[PDB]
């Protein structure tokens, strides 16, 4: 197992992780090497395929020209996994498009063939023991898993010996249920991975731990004091949203309803859905109509980013914020969602002033809605610092960069390479 911790039966939460010793805020509970992992397509050329090191002058794979490495050792070490995609990418060319889930699942199957025994990533929970929720799958979810299984056979039949379709549905379901997205310091998606021991942890909307990454290594650090006998909880989702939203996401992706202190008390729901203090106050049904509209625009924008232009996307943000502002306060989470999306579009367009303009409005409400140590808060401070620095506002930039560092020292560890990069940014000016 893992020192100072143990696997246990968490009543009404299946298996979980329990503390056997005290952990103070910022203490590393444990580390978990990725069992299987995949660098996202959009990050190729920016990060090493093998170790995820972000570097300039990465060496390109001579065959496919679509994998980049630190050196010949990272290249060689990645080959058992890279071979699943190397020649297929050149053969299928433009037609090579497996989803990230399929790419990761191919790697799980490849690892199971090479290393059938329990790995150092499975000290407490094994990939084979993962919860699948197979019994809870409706026709829509089974159809999505069937598309994934067809893509797996379509792109990965060369090296893989496939189990029956039934074993593949259980696998794809286990991957959806237990998979992690690996994010950088700005919470940008880097790739997807399996961290079996990290997946043993149950969810809470007031977690006592944060998961961070040192390349492909997951690190679990306390963000609240943990005492012997206490269960170790991480958040599976973005905690900005009110109770109903959070639980709709948890029911849809994880097949459970959270009953943590946040979900029970609903303490932050009032401020999260803050209403304007108008002379004629807005009616209850007028609030409910706007909450319904707000959730619909969030989904409309999600779809729109795949095909609409940056100006069309900013229009959706501006127009929706205008409609919402008649009922909702600027600190309201639905207003904040659109502002964050609009900031993201500005960043892409290299409109640094526009991105800064939005970030400035987001930061204070973020601090109030998110937990004490929050990667979402740290990430926003970091973006703001970098924008201020980029725009020659060095004193404001240094203040924001130091606010990012203060949170990151707890979540990532005082010695994290991300903090050394930020300090170099402060020092170089």
């Amino acid at each position: 197992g893992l020192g100072g911790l143990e696997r246990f039966c968490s009543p009404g939460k299946g298996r979980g992780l329990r503390a056997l010793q005290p952990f103070q805020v910022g203490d590393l509970l444990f580390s978990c090497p990725a069992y299987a992992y995949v660098l996202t397509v959009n990050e190729r050329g920016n990060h090493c395929e093998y170790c995820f090191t972000r570097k300039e002058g990465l060496s390109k794979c001579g065959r496919c020209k679509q994998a980049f490495y630190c050196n010949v050792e990272c290249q060689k070490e990645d080959w058992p996994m890279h071979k699943l995609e190397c020649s297929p990418m050149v053969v299928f060319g433009e037609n090579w498009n497996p989803s990230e889930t399929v790419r990761l699942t191919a790697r799980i199957l490849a690892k199971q063939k090479i290393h059938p025994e329990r790995t150092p990533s499975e000290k407490l929970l094994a990939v084979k023991e993962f919860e699948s929720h197979l019994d809870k799958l409706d026709n829509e979810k089974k159809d999505l898993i069937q598309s994934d299984i067809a893509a797996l056979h379509h792109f990965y039949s060369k090296h893989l010996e496939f189990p029956d379709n039934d074993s593949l549905v259980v696998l794809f379901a286990q991957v959806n249920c237990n998979g992690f997205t690996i994010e950088d310091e700005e919470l940008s998606h880097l790739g997807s991975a399996i961290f079996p021991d990290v997946a043993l942890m149950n969810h809470s909307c007031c977690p006592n731990v944060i998961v961070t990454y040192k390349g492909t290594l997951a690190e679990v650090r306390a963000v609240q004091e943990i005492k012997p006998g206490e269960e170790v909880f991480t958040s599976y989702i973005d905690l900005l949203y009110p109770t109903e939203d959070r639980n709709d996401r948890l029911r849809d992706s994880y097949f459970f309803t959270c009953e943590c202190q946040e979900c029970t008390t609903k303490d932050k729901d009032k401020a999260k859905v803050e209403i304007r203090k108008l002379s004629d106050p807005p009616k209850a049904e007028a609030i409910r109509d706007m909450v319904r509209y707000a959730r619909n625009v969030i989904e409309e924008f999600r779809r729109a980013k795949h095909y609409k232009s940056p100006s069309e996307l900013l229009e959706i943000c501006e127009l929706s914020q205008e409609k919402m502002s008649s009922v909702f306060e600027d600190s309201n989470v639905y207003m904040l969602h659109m502002m964050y999306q609009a900031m993201g579009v500005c960043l892409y367009m290299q409109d640094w002033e526009g991105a800064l303009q939005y970030g400035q409005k987001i930061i204070k409400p973020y601090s109030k809605h998110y937990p004490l140590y929050s990667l979402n808060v740290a990430s926003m401070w970091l973006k703001l610092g970098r924008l201020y620095m980029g725009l020659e506002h060095k004193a404001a930039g240094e203040k924001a960069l130091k606010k990012a560092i203060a949170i990151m020292e707890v979540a990532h560890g005082k010695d994290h390479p991300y903090i050394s990069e930020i300090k170099q940014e402060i020092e170089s000016h």
């Binding site: 998979g179 992690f180 997205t181 994010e183 997946a199 599976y236 973005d238 996401r249 979402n376 990430s379």
Partner: peptide
């Protein structure tokens, strides 16, 4: 997948 932002 299990992350801070979706």
């Amino acid at each position: 997948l299990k992350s801070k932002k979706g």
